Design a protein around this nucleic acid. Structure first.
Length: 50
DNA sequence: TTATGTAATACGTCTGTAACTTGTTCTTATGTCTGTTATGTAGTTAATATAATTGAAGGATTTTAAGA
């Protein structure tokens, strides 16, 4: 169980290093939606329509 | 004129320095042997139990072998 939670919180694609140049970077990073990651799209397999 | 005696001078030279060399003698670093402890290997255990496993996912086109 610890391994699963630390996998998700330490090695996930969506668990990213915080952007901290300025407050706007923080707010924008927290309000970001990614179609990539597990269960999502890959960049060499995502067409124009999406 | 010529013996004589001092004096400059050049050459041996006796001795003081120093180089070359060995004895030997002591000290130390190293290689080796031996004894002890930890490590590494191996064999055995006898209610009974008898077809995995875990994912993973909006691809878009070409070319080229098998099947009919």
């Amino acid at each position: 169980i610890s391994a699963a939670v630390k996998e998700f919180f330490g090695s996930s694609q969506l668990s990213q290093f915080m952007d901290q140049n300025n407050p706007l970077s923080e707010v924008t990073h927290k309000r970001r939606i990614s179609a990539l990651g597990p269960g999502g799209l890959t960049r060499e397999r995502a067409g124009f329509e999406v």
